[PDB]
Design a protein around this ligand. Structure first.
Ligand code: CLA
Ligand code: CLA
Ligand code: CLA
Ligand code: CLA
Ligand code: CLA
Ligand code: CLA
Ligand code: CLA
Ligand code: CLA
Ligand SMILES: CCCCCCCCCCCCCCCC(=O)OC[C@H](COP(=O)(O)OC[C@@H](O)CO)OC(=O)CCCCCCCCCCCCCCC
Ligand SMILES: CC1=C(/C=C/C(C)=C/C=C/C(C)=C/C=C/C=C(C)/C=C/C=C(C)/C=C/C2=C(C)CCCC2(C)C)C(C)(C)CCC1
Ligand code: SF4
Lengths: 742, 227, 86, 40
């Protein structure tokens, strides 16, 4: 019964610049200094690999804890800059008056070498680069009405950034927690559930109830922003709040007397979108965060720390034991309290999956005012948070394999769930292998079937709505069920959560904010492409984790490590057998799969949702050509890539000309990467020998011997440039397109 | 926290009795979170700083508790002009709540003198905690004679801070320290009561007491939720 | 008058029931955890809280069952108003 | 201070200062002599 308590060590390390002048001090191998250029790359590659510098878990934990303070400090500088640039280099104040006609802008360029053309005409008597980060919509929702309020937040952001860097220094050099402190998982969950998420949600509800709701109620009514009461006047004067919301006339007595229905005027359950602004009701959002606050505060009292009551996480795991799974979850608690990589593997997996869920829910239920009708912001936010989720998931595979090689110990795992999974890995990979082949034929083969039938003049033989049909009947049933939910299954909800299920469109400023989305044959075909490309990415990453330690090819792969190039040309060739190489290959397939996801979103929205409302009806940007054209590969090439890339390639000579340059430059970086992917360092080391000879001939040969990159670094350099070039190409193409037409 | 006196308070636990041995003033065994455990202590969470901080909080709170109500009591008795019968939160500390015009200077001009005066008072007090006895060495207009401290940071003693050398005997001094801590702890709760009562009712501490005595049932925390 | 109303009586009854249940060995307490079979067994408390109560009822049991009683009472009060009973 | 000045002498720090200086000089020249195409 080890008590939960604060435990630190005093002055563990000395604050000196001595080691700043000795590169490689952290590692025994690199401490001797460079002899070849390979040393330089090894210095940066192993800088943050704490688990390999020392075998002491306590020393590893202390570095992780302070390295996290540095990450927090950097985010505050970044957040401070965004708020500062809104105050000093933005047209936010003008935007508040005319949100539907003025384009948000918060970056201004200097007039040098003729780059001032990038300062486009955005409105409000202002010239600058149009932003798609959605900060203006967020600030309006919170109630910010002046650049002074933006300026104060930026100054507070810098103070927080300074505090974060002090904390990192303090908790590493002055008072470093001990290992027993880091292993109170029960205590950490209690504080992070009820304290971080719980009180954070309650505190934000306080801001919305007292600041956001009154300010946005008057803004929607048409009051001039400068004439709205200041947030502190709303807080101090209950009389003002009573005018906007009569419930405030009764104070907090209804809360304590359980007459919670008194607060129905500002704690609503409307659902749908606010017709004036096209975003979610803030009164709905306040009741959401109040409900979420109670749920998490209750959640934070589940685990036992010092007073008997509560649950032991070890006891829960050991009780869940069945007939089909041997020992069961035994041994997981020790794994998850002694392996940072195991924790990172789980957290990256769910944190990445969460970022993808955010993308879907924010577009379908636009939570900020004037977010929906700003098509550039909708496209950018969905695409940004899908890419973030994709990279995190691939990392989850990377750090699951690191755990398998380094932190896995067979003695602690005998006949438990983890052990039994390893003992039928061939069954898992063989079945997942077949599923991917099945899904590739029956999804991408349909496109090839349609392309061939169309080229042969046999449209009646294609898979389409006017031909052989493939209707997503299951998805269509769910769309109808959610559309009728307020009638019978959610009686107290006035409207459906989203307008995608069905009903009538909401139009703000003559543009569609959201309308029902219909699923047809093309939607059926594209969705099963997603299932195909996701399943393949699982195959590559799961295969790397399950075969990290051994396989039928390399029986002792664990001893080779996690990151090695091969085991030589024997056995026919063993290139790229290490678990690191399964992340390397998995990155390509993740990029392949998410590219189709963001092409699907971009074409579907422009074709079927986005558009201009007029007397006759809705005219969409691409005029509803998704249904008939997206069932062939030729349709995507012609109607999507070729037609919509018109904006980016005609950008020269305008404020969008920067996107044209990056469109070409991205194409360049991508092709440049194939040099590293298609070649091997054997050629390049011999090339450097001849180059070194010329320098030797001129007495200008370096003391640090030039070396061609290692095998692994060639693959890492290749994939990094491949991803940057490919993703930046879509980024330029999307923004130049949507900003130009959207 | 058991009110009044007792050997141990409600929250006393067998774990806290390990290191709470009665040496400190007002040591009633109440430490449910175990912040005073000597083992593996560091930073500001250590016995010497936490005990020192409580006394400092006690002494500021005692001045605050008596000073946040005296203007109302003296004003109610007619001993000071009504122009200065002002609620503690309407003196100027929180201008949005209320400010008093009539000080010899603008409240920001007065604040700068407060900054300079407290910089000397507080940084010199700190240096005696970091380097005991160090403030009695460097020349300070001859005043260093009274800043030599006594080894215990919270109780400097000396010719000035112990002007009338009360508590000459060891037993007497312990009783005085206990009385100081209990009054100080009581004042710390009183100050929190002033702050909470100001928000809930918007009136001064003296007004709240008078109203409660008038109709105790109709005037209390429960009835003030709504008005 | 709030005192004596349906809302007040339910909250006092629900809060009293949990305290009565916990004190008389009908609900889990600080000194009695519950096994997987929903049976009370002795527990180990890191910060053994001294209590003069003959049954060892500590102040933590009060907070644990005060909140549990309030949760039960609040749900009943709001639930009845939902069906129209209250 | 000797060690700190040694840290500033490391290759990445020197390159940052050197290119920051080099870039600044080129930027400033084009600020006062915009659009140079021929020596003239
Ligand atoms: C994520 C962080 C971030 C980023 C990427 C930028 C980026 C930029 N800032 Mg900003 N800035 C930030 C945070 C950030 N800032 C913060 C936290 C503050 C508060 C101190 C400022 C205060 C600030 C000012 C005062 C100015 C900029 C300016 C600039 C621009 C020119 C910078 C330059 O070349 O300086 C010169 C390079 C070196 C000194 C090296 C550039 C777009 C300038 C601008 O946009 O002018 C039109 C400008 O005047 N920034
Ligand atoms: C001036 C204050 C100071 C000083 C003199 C030291 C000194 C020391 N620290 Mg400490 N430290 C400090 C502040 C300081 N620290 C702070 C603020 C933190 C919190 C983050 C830490 C956290 C910390 C940890 C966790 C560790 C040390 C360690 C060390 C030792 C070696 C550090 C080294 O080689 O740095 C040279 C390194 C750099 C100059 C890199 C700076 C990185 C920062 C975060 C900036 C990041 C910028 C970012 C990449 C920008 C984007 C880049 C993009 C634009 C290209 C040494 C005793 C190490 C040790 O004792 O090992 C045995 C160790 O593990 N320190
Ligand atoms: C964390 C979130 C949060 C916060 C901080 C607040 C804060 C506030 N709410 Mg709000 N509220 C919230 C959530 C929140 N609310 C939620 C979720 C709901 C929905 C149920 C409401 C519904 C609601 C209503 C209906 C009303 C408020 C009101 C208020 C105000 C007065 C409350 C009151 O009477 O307090 C009573 C007393 C206290 C809170 C105690 C104060 C303790 C002080 C700070 C101690 C200071 C001690 C210190 C030592 C003294 C200073 C010394 C120094 C100078 C030397 C206050 C600004 C009222 C108001 O005025 O609205 C305009 C009001 O009518 N709220
Ligand atoms: C919370 C996030 C997180 C954290 C804390 C870590 C932490 C760690 N990872 Mg993991 N990882 C993550 C996410 C994370 N990872 C994700 C999302 C992926 C998938 C891509 C991976 C994939 C991965 C691999 C494959 C490996 C690690 C490794 C490591 C370890 C050493 C890393 C190192 O030394 O980097 C040093 C940092 C660098 C050399 C800098 C990299 C710079 C990149 C390539 C720049 C890309 C472009 C840039 C962002 C934008 C343009 C720049 C401009 C100048 C042009 C360390 C424990 C390594 C290890 O050995 O672990 C045991 C290892 O082999 N990670
Ligand atoms: C367009 C390029 C392309 C194509 C077509 C494929 C195809 C395939 N890859 Mg590969 N891959 C590519 C690029 C490509 N890859 C690249 C660039 C990389 C490097 C990053 C990789 C890395 C990679 C890995 C690491 C893996 C794959 C896997 C797969 C397979 C997926 C499942 C499957 O069987 O689908 C079905 C097959 C197809 C869709 C191919 C086209 C089928 C046509 C349209 C129909 C059949 C034709 C018909 C019979 C008529 C023939 C007539 C003729 C005989 C006369 C498949 C063979 C995975 C695998 O093997 O899973 C089991 C796998 O693990 N690929
Ligand atoms: C991830 C965040 C984090 C975590 C987990 C810890 C953890 C720890 N810190 Mg560290 N610390 C952090 C951030 C963190 N710190 C930061 C950001 C700073 C810079 C400000 C510091 C500065 C710091 C110091 C100087 C010390 C510690 C100490 C400690 C230890 C005891 C903490 C304790 O009991 O606090 C309990 C909390 C309190 C006693 C203070 C409560 C009130 C604070 C000042 C404000 C809290 C604000 C709240 C979150 C939001 C209010 C909302 C609204 C009302 C305004 C423990 C190892 C101590 C130590 O080493 O002990 C051995 C120690 O001396 N920390
Ligand atoms: C922490 C302690 C504290 C603080 C910060 C304050 C702060 C305040 N009090 Mg309060 N007060 C306190 C404690 C405190 N009080 C206590 C304990 C009591 C009970 C005794 C009172 C009783 C009280 C009353 C009755 C009044 C205040 C008032 C005030 C306000 C005006 C202060 C002023 O004008 O001072 C004046 C400045 C001084 C007394 C210091 C003079 C400094 C010179 C340089 C000294 C020169 C000395 C000379 C050379 C030699 C000695 C001469 C001598 C022998 C004659 C201000 C908000 C007034 C108020 O609210 O007005 C609206 C008010 O009427 N307070
Ligand atoms: C006398 C006892 C009593 C009575 C008569 C009621 C009656 C009611 N309660 Mg209440 N309740 C009580 C006790 C009682 N409660 C207690 C003791 C608690 C504390 C545990 C609660 C906690 C509670 C909550 C949290 C909620 C209610 C709600 C309701 C109302 C709707 C319930 C319904 O039809 O859900 C039918 C709901 C479904 C069929 C949906 C099931 C699918 C789930 C939600 C999906 C997610 C599952 C998982 C997380 C994944 C109803 C008037 C609800 C309400 O306020 O309605 C307006 C509500 O949200 N009660
Ligand atoms: C579904 C199968 C559930 C299976 C299920 O719930 O089984 C339940 C069964 C659990 O048995 P026990 O009761 O002994 O488990 C005790 C637990 O507490 C774990 O220790 O699990 C297994 O036997 C594990 C191996 C299942 C092997 C399944 C093979 C088929 C996989 C098909 C995957 C389809 C994915 C579709 C995604 C939409
Ligand atoms: C027998 C006896 C006695 C008596 C006692 C008594 C009479 C007691 C009482 C007690 C009590 C009377 C207690 C209470 C408590 C309470 C609490 C602790 C509460 C809590 C609450 C909460 C936590 C809440 C929450 C919430 C919110 C806020 C919102 C909504 C939701 C919920 C509900 C969750 C004496 C000692 C004298 C002596 C000996 C014997
Ligand atoms: S050296 Fe290159 S080609 Fe040869 S086995 Fe290793 S990775 Fe393959």
């Amino acid at each position: 019964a080890k008590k939960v308590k604060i435990a630190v060590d005093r002055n563990p390390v000395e604050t000196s610049f001595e080691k700043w002048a000795k590169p490689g001090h952290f590692s025994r191998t690199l401490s001797k200094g460079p002899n070849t250029t390979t040393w330089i790359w090894n210095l940066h590659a192993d800088a943050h690999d704490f688990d390999s510098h020392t075998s002491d878990l306590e020393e590893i934990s202390r570095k992780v804890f302070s390295a996290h303070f540095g990450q927090l400090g950097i985010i505050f500088i970044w957040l401070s800059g965004m708020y500062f640039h809104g105050a000093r280099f933005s047209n936010y104040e003008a935007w508040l008056s005319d949100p539907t006609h003025i384009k948000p802008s918060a970056q201004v360029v200097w007039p040098i070498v003729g780059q001032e053309i990038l300062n486009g005409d955005v409105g409000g008597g202002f010239q600058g680069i149009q932003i798609t980060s959605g900060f203006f919509q967020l600030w309006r929702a919170s109630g910010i009405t002046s650049e002074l309020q933006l300026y104060t937040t930026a100054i507070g952001g810098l103070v927080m950034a300074a505090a974060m860097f002090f904390a990192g220094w303090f908790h590493y050099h002055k008072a470093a927690p001990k290992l027993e402190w880091f292993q109170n998982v029960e205590s950490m969950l209690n504080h992070h559930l009820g304290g971080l998420l719980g009180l954070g949600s309650l505190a934000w509800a306080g801001h919305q109830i007292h600041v956001s709701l009154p300010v946005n109620k008057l803004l929607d009514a048409g009051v001039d922003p400068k004439e709205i009461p200041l947030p502190h006047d709303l807080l101090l004067n209950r009389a003002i709040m009573a005018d906007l919301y009569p419930s405030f006339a009764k104070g907090i007595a209804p809360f304590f007397t359980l007459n919670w229905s008194e607060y129905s005027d500002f704690l609503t359950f409307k659902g749908g979108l606010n017709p004036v602004t096209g975003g979610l009701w803030l009164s709905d959002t306040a009741h959401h965060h109040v409900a979420i606050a109670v749920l998490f505060l209750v959640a934070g009292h589940m685990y036992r720390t010092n007073w008997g009551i509560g649950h032991s996480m070890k006891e829960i795991l050991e009780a869940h034991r069945g007939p089909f799974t041997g020992e069961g979850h035994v041994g997981l608690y020790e794994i998850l309290t002694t392996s940072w990589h195991a924790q990172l593997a789980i957290n990256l997996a769910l944190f990445g999956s969460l970022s993808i869920i955010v993308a879907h829910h924010m577009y379908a239920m636009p939570p900020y005012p004037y977010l929906a009708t700003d098509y550039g912001t909708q496209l950018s936010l969905f695409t940004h948070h899908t890419w973030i989720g994709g990279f995190c998931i691939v990392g989850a595979g990377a750090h699951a394999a690191i755990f398998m090689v380094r932190d896995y110990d067979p003695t602690n795992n005998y006949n438990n769930l983890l052990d039994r999974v390893i003992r039928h890995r061939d069954a898992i990979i063989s079945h997942l292998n077949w599923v991917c082949i099945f899904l590739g034929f029956h999804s991408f083969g349909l496109y090839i079937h349609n392309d061939t039938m169309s080229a042969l003049g046999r449209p009646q033989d294609m898979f389409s709505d006017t031909a052989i049909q493939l209707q997503p009947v299951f998805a269509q049933w769910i769309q109808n069920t959610h559309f009728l939910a307020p009638q019978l299954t959610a009686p107290n909800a006035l409207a459906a959560t989203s307008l995608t299920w069905g009903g009538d469109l909401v139009a703000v400023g003559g543009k569609v904010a959201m309308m029902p989305i219909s699923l047809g044959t093309s939607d059926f075909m594209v969705h099963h492409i997603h299932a195909f490309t996701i399943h393949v990415t699982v195959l590559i990453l799961l295969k790397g984790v399950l075969f990290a330690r051994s396989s039928r090819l390399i029986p002792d792969k664990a001893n080779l490590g996690f990151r090695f190039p091969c085991d030589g040309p024997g056995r026919g060739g063993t290139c790229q057998v290490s678990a690191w190489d399964h992340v390397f290959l998995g990155l390509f397939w993740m990029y392949n799969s998410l590219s189709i996801v963001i092409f699907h979103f971009s074409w579907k929205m422009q074709s079927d949702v986005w558009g201009t409302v007029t007397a006759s009806g809705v005219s969409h940007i691409t005029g509803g050509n998704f249904a008939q054209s997206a069932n062939t590969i030729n349709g995507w090439l012609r109607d999507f890539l070729w037609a919509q890339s018109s904006q980016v390639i005609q950008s020269y000579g305008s404020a969008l000309s920067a996107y044209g340059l990056i469109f070409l430059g991205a194409h360049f970086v991508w092709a440049f990467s194939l040099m590293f992917l298609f070649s091997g360092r054997g050629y390049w080391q011999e090339l450097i020998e001849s180059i070194v000879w010329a320098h030797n001939k001129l007495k200008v040969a370096p003391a640090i011997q030039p070396r061609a990159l290692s095998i692994t670094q060639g693959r890492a350099v290749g994939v990094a440039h491949y991803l940057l070039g490919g993703i930046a190409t879509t980024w330029s193409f999307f923004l130049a397109r949507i900003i130009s037409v959207g | 926290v058991d009110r009044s006196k007792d050997q141990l308070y409600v929250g006393a636990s067998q774990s806290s009795l390990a290191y709470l041995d009665g040496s400190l003033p007002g040591d009633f065994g109440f430490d449910p979170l175990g912040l005073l455990d000597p083992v593996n202590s560091g930073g500001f969470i250590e016995p010497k700083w936490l005990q020192y901080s409580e006394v400092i909080h006690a002494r500021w709170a005692m001045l605050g508790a008596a000073g946040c109500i005296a203007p109302e009591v003296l004003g109610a008795a007619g001993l000071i002009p009504d122009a200065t019968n002002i609620k503690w939160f309407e003196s100027g500390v929180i201008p949005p709540a209320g400010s008093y015009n009539g000080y010899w200077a603008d409240p920001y001009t007065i604040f700068f003198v407060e900054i300079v005066a407290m910089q000397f008072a507080e940084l010199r007090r700190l240096q005696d905690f970091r380097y005991p006895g160090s403030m009695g060495q460097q020349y300070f207009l001859g005043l260093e004679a009274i800043f030599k401290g006594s080894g215990d940071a919270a109780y400097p003693g000396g010719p000035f801070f112990n002007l009338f050398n009360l508590g000459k005997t060891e037993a007497a001094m312990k009783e005085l320290k206990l009385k100081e801590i209990k009054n100080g702890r009581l004042a710390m709760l009183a100050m929190l009561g002033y702050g909470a009562q100001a928000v809930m009712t918007g009136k001064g501490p003296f007004q709240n007491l008078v109203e409660h005595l008038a109709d105790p049932v109709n005037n209390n925390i429960l009835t003030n939720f709504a008005g | 008058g709030f005192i004596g109303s349906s809302t007040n009586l339910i909250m006092v009854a629900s809060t009293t029931a949990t305290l009565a249940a916990a004190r008389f060995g009908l609900a889990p307490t600080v000194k009695k955890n519950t096994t997987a079979g929903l049976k009370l067994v002795d527990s180990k408390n890191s910060a053994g809280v001294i209590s003069n109560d003959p049954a060892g009822f500590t102040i933590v049991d009060v907070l644990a069952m005060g909140a549990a009683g309030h949760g039960l009472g609040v749900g009943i009060v709001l639930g009845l108003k939902g069906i129209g009973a209250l | 201070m000797k060690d700190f000045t040694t840290y500033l002498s490391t290759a990445p720090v020197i390159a940052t200062i050197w290119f920051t200086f080099t870039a600044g000089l080129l930027i400033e020249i084009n600020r006062y002599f915009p659009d140079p195409l021929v020596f003239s």
